[PDB]
Amino acid sequence: LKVNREIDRCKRVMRERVWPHIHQVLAQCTVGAVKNPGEPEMPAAFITRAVSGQVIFQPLAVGEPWGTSWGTTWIRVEGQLPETLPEGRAIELVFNLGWLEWPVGGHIEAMAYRADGTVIKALHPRNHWMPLVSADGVKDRVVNPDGSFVVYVEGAYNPNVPSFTVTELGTKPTGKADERYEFSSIDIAALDQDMFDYWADLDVVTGSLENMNDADPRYWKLAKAMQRSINLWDEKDYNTLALARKALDKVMHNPANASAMTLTAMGHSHIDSAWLWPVRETERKVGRTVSNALALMDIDPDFTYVMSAAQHFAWLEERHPDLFERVKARIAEGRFIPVGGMWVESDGTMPCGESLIRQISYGKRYFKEKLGVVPNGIWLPDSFGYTGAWPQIAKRSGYSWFLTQKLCWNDTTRLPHHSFMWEGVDGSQIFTHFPPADKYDSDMSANDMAYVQSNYKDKDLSDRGILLFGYGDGGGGPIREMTMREHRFESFEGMPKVEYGTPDDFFSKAETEMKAEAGSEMPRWKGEFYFELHRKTLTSQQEMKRGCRKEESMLRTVEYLGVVASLESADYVYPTERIDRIWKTLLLSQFHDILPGSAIEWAHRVAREEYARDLKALSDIARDAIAAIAVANPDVARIAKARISQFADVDPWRPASLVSCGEPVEVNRREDGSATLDNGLLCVHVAADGTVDSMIDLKSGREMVAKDHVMGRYEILKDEPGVFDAWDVERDAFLCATALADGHIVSIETTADGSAVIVTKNSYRDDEISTTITLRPGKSQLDFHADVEWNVPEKLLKVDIPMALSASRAQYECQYGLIERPIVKNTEGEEAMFESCSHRFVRIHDSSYGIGVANGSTYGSDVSSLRDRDDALAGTMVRMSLVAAPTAPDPRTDIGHHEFDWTVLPCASVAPLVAAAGEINAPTIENMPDIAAPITLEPIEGTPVIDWIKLADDGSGDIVARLYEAAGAKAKAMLHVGGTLDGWTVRETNTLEQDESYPDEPAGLIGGKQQAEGAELALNPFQLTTLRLSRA
Template sequence: MHLNPSHVVARLQRVVRDRIRPRLHTPLAEVTIDAWRVDGDGEPVPAARAIEHGDFQPFTVGDTWAPAWGTTWLRVQGQVPASELPVELVLDLGWFDHSVGGHAEGLAYRPDGVAVKALHPRNGWVRLTGPGAAPGVLADDGSFTLYVEAAANPLLLGLPPFIETHLGEKPGLGEPEPYKLVSAGLCAFDPEIFALLRDLEATGDLLPHLSTDEPRYWRVLTAVEAALDAPTVAGARAALADALARPAHATAHRMTAVGHAHIDSAWLWPLRETRRKVARTLTNVLTLMETDPDLIYAMSSAQQFAWVEQDHPELFERVKQRVAEGRIVPVGGMWVESDAVMPGGEALVRQITYGKRYFMDTFGHESEVVWLPDSFGYSGAWPQIARQAGYRWFLTQKISWNDTTTFPHHTFQWEGIDGTRILTHFPPADTYAAEVTSAELKHAVSNFRDKAISSHSLLLFGYGDGGGGPNREMVARAHRFADLEGAARVELGRPEEFFTAAEAELGDAAPVWAGELYLELHRGTLTSQVAMKQGNRRSEALLRTVEYLATVAAVRDGVPYPYKQLDEAWKTVLLHQFHDILPGSSISWVHREARERYRNLEVDLKGLLPVGRGEPGKISGWSVAREGDWAKPAGNILDNGILRVEVDGGGRVSSLVDLRDGRQLNVGDLGVLRLYRDEPVRWDAWDLDRHVLRNETSLPQPTVTATSDAITVTTKTGKSTFIVKYRLREGVAAAAANGAAAGGAAASGAAGTAAAQLDITVDVDWQETEHLLKLSLPVAVRTLRAKYETQFGSIERPTHENTLADEAQYEVCSHRWVHVAEPGLGVGVVNDSTYGCDVRRIPGGTDIRPTLLRAPRFPDPDTDRGRHTFRFAVVAGDETVTRAAADDLNAPWLEALADVEPLLGLEIESGHAVIDWIKLADDRSGDVIARVHETRGGRAVARLTSTFPASIVETDLLERPLEATGDRLILGPFQITTLRLSPIKE
């Protein structure tokens, strides 16, 4: 028999599309539909309200439903006819055959308000009879009533290629109705047709990945042709049976396949919609588990479990049962899948402690794997934080998105800034939403970069981002690939099973990657939606202050510690650190709500300041220097006896001199605002492309004026206004007096001088589109590397572009400070609310350029329009002085703070260390928790001092005891130590 491969493949596609797939569902009977559009603003209502009080009106196929973002409830009723095959209700709400989770979705409920199954473009059925039928739906006489909550979410993901849209907010009245009910009816589902489709997928889709030089190719091709010739379904399956029975090669790559649905807690939909997405996804997973006992589903984010617990208690009980069986696996142990570079160190700790405690209290389960498949880069502090929280493994795949270099490993030991290592895996399929296709398996095998030492990888399958999870087609494919010649071996399993096996296989042979996992993409997320950055930074600072002062009041005066209020505050902060909220890559609706929550949170936290004996005073803002603390300008010159600043007629600092040694600190003009055309190639809010920094837009000549305490430079262009103020503090102030005391931190071994710094305030009325704003601060320091603050330490990055990887870091994350140094001179730049930054060598020195604002068009075309204030300081001194200035600039100013005697302190014997955080223990025992860390990447010896008698025990990050500890601490480079002080009653 002569076989033409291209003819067979084309025939296969046609037969499947036109002759087999249409037979999967055979229409049996019509249904009756009534509809109720949710009143008022169309926001979701509880199922009980819709079912009991909805004004349902007749509705037919072809009718439109709901405006964008609206909700329509459908009441579907019918009589199930007799059938030897399972009967399913099949609905098409008007969706596209793509972007699952990215547009219309539905959730079916019984009349008693219990959710039974979700509907989406690849899962538009509810089974009524046969194996896996929805329980409690069908009456004895064969009748049924189902209520479908239909969500009219607009299709934003499919906009080609992410163009400007105003659908990120609810449209106005008269907005066209986007969806039409295409079909609804009762159908017989044919399991043999379904099985044949999967058989043909497994064989036909395998062909492009087999070599035509091998017998296997031709035998599979022959089997497919014979199946297409067969007159019956049984005959077709029999023709394929031998080809499907051939086992995989002995050396075939192994893949542990885990059902998954990476659900963004907010993105192209608001938080309220995510609550519904999680419930919809879980109903689908639970339905699938009824008919497939091998399916394992991994789900992260304690917040998402908590939403289901609140919104759907019946569904949550089913989830708990599957967790107890080990079939639903809570992974990650974090409150949300947060951004992994911008949250502060303590915030990352709380992501873990809140998440892990929820999982342990609710399910009796502690995850051992950090689960962050989609965050935009990973701080080098993660390995230590993870291991100190009880994790053994780390998972992501996002680094596969690099735009410049290819990461060299998929399974490796990741070494953090302190030297801690954690086994890390990147699934080589390069996705967290696989569909278990032959193409995905082939890519994973060929892409896997550790073949010489490992034969095993992880496959996460199921619709993600907008949810949906695995469907029955995916699971059937996984079974076909369990042991099939020409493909990887696929086994449904748990993440822990994979990591345990990989750990055993690699032994000591795992390669090591040291330092951060920098994502060479999405650099703009360090700047987009500046209110997210400012809200997060200020919330972290306020929590640090309030928890410290509440601890002081509790220990000294017996004032009740506000556990509940602080828990709620932390959960708000942690939720908004999600990796599409804090990075500024969500629709305007999300950020509008977040701005309001941050404002309310600030009010609430200020209200938690303890009142009573030794009251520390009220928070009055973030201005460290008060009236009369600023040096008065003499014309365009500022001089406080320590620094001398000259501002030229163009508003630039032409001279910045350290009067202590006469050294010129700037090289060229300092303080220049630089405006660039910012026109990303693809991901608007996400990406800052290379070409942007080549396209500077000239700004008009500014006006320069001197006031009683500042030199002010005002520039106007178009509708935007930029006001830069230069100020020097008068005399010498106590470095970090405010920051250290307010946060509970102790001195780190060297006192700085807060007057050796030039303070710069930038006020912007931002009315730009597709532009980017930077502040240029060129300093006369020649160095090959700069230091940037990161969680519990700092990281060094190159200031040159010697290699592709060096050049790719043209925009990086800095927390509160950057420091550059050469022998005999150090200069730092501190900020109060920015994260994006670039530091590059220039003739004679180094240009430090924080990024202030962007104006992307998608997904929020009005990003950051309005007024913003940024504060910076250029600080002369070593790294410790810079850190102290950053403490001052970022801590809220407290009146009468000097009257509060520090609760704890560190006496430094050698090196550098701080008490980073002080709070009461989470178990409400009244014990005091102190988080200490080394700050300079060296070694430190310090003695902890306390104003109250206490026994001291070292703990892990979840405050579980490790060993008894004295008051003398020996710390390694960037080491974190958590100490539990139990007061001793006298």
């Protein structure tokens, strides 16, 4: 059609006949540079060293790469600012350092400083210009009395790292220029605002023709004015410009339709704290983005910008002190908004409950003392699913709403609604919203308006949405082209109304109006947000998953010992600052890019050796605190190899030992190679090739292994996905798995305590798996411990546990509580859940029985039914993923020597499973005097569990316990305290240890603040309460 061919003419007119005549080049500047391929130094220490004499600045070469990979080049620019400058026009430098266009935050960047150490503005691929004079006769401070000036530019020659492709770029500074980026004559230019407005109008108009339909007369009244204008603009006669704009004005002022939506736009750039670059680079990225944000708050007023991740604010505070006081000046104004008080945008499903609570707490604490703000909602646009315990934690932490967008990438199903009420397992509900643009980084195009209005899933009762724009995922922020195409879409009949705003006001009014409109028809979602994509993120880099749990499972012990030692010994200083530093370092390695393990080899290498260092430092605070208890109770008892595991079967926080102390375990070797372990409580029969093939529960007398199957068979899948190698698993892999039928028992023995051990070996073509199966006296559980020497890439290992019990749903655990997922997947959407998360245990049960499996560091599994060889129902298979080896961002990921531990239990109720999980995840310590816990609850009914006894953060000396219910039934208990804190009071708080109550949340205590000894507790299913004990 004629119009579609007229759109191409208009776009080419924009690109060649209008765009170049915006920056009129006046003069070019002399340049000299100094290169450095090493690690960068602080800019302030370089400038003052670069002002006196101590740098030479050998001139650059036009047409050659100005740096090396992962290096820094400092450039001294000197211009002249000649006279006869155009009147009423702005003057600005233009830096064209060989930019590409596709990745904004990916390849090279830069930052321009003044000759005192102060930032001017950052330089990015699509935003490369620096204001000298502002079209009003006022100059920047870096201008002499004459036209002389001098600028320093720190340029980062970051390589462009492909997402999924084998490369050597994400390892270390190479010292070579792999991708060539030229220099090409930094220069000075005058800006023409009228041509720039004309280009903006053309852009707005021509982008609306691709998205309208040829049925409204506006499609034709537009395409006529677009044609009349470009037929009138002759770039060789400037006086025609004023004629061309008047033609493209009879259509720019048309009031929006009556029923059009209303969008609240705010500037937002998402910065992945570590992904495709080292963590030593994110600091500069935050600096650049923030500087860009403030240089756009003087192009126009009423522009708003949001920023999350208090850790980014801290990084900014240390590197650019001057750029911090400019932010605070905008915060008090109201145009700069910090949102979602959290340390970093953590992962949404893997961290435990205490991780999330501590993230919220540290974030709220930083946002208070520094910026003085109190956020009202959780900002989490990018995450691989959400745990389902989030609503309760958010509501009990003072929050009011919630924000997500990542759940659009699901491979099978689309969620029904965009704005809805999300109810967790407890019952508390939070208002949640997805930005209808299906992405956080928009460019404020006409395509995005058309999509937002034509995709919004609740247009019948909401007509209100949010809209984020800016260049994200690597920084950069929004560009001044986006802001000046927003004023065109303010009314613009044919498209949604758009206006600036803050998130809190949008959320308040949107929720209240949707409520008062819908009635008791408000959309609702109960449960978790299962992410139907990126299944391999549960096991991508195993040393990160093992590190997140081992460090956090022992922070519990270290913090508990600080409580016990601060009550026994009269002089013992609890090291608050070291613990705070360790906690912040931990919360930084739970970002949504490094816990899933989908970053470059460099990032994981640094994050891995941090776990080693903080693990070591933690087990010195422990032994130094235990030394204090050892002198306070000098003659009670001391045991080596103790494990303080919360919620045991008899004594909750007593430090139990490793010596089992039962009667020996009789072992009956058979002649064919098989063996028979038999303690008082189990009768295990191990076959000739590992693989326990029958397990009797001698108490009840039930087989525990599904017939014609063996427990412990190893499979190795062949996973070579289409895209996102380190991210997701094909379903095809589940078809290709091959068992390792070869194998044998290496050794059968008994030990000093009386337990029996069996040592097995297994191999697949290069690598070796040696398992140790243990049976201890007086414990109704079987323990497995495997050591892997993984060497072959592109493979995936997992073990299976065939259970002799058949049910319709499987039971996992959440951060606080439990969930169930189907076993046999019926519909198309259910088959998308073929692999799922599991914190610390999975249970398959029925009305009166059940079998459970608890793990140490795995985090991943999948369940399916089992059918006998005569085709009758046999049981259920539970497979849990151990280690995978991708190749995309990390060529040499997960090579060599992984450990794994797990255990299998017969459990009618859920209490012994929780006890076994807690007891397998606890760290070991030495020379620990055994003394009763200070806080104890006697269970009158149900199963309440005290999780995280710890000290107060106010330094006052109070105790804070975080107790919940872990069975799904109401629980009644009462508190008993030891003889070291009698006379103390107890009271109820929120998760942040503050006296704040909420009318829509039940409480634990009955009454108010009363005596601790004897206070009773009632807990409705999956409730999370926090007790605070004070001396008075």
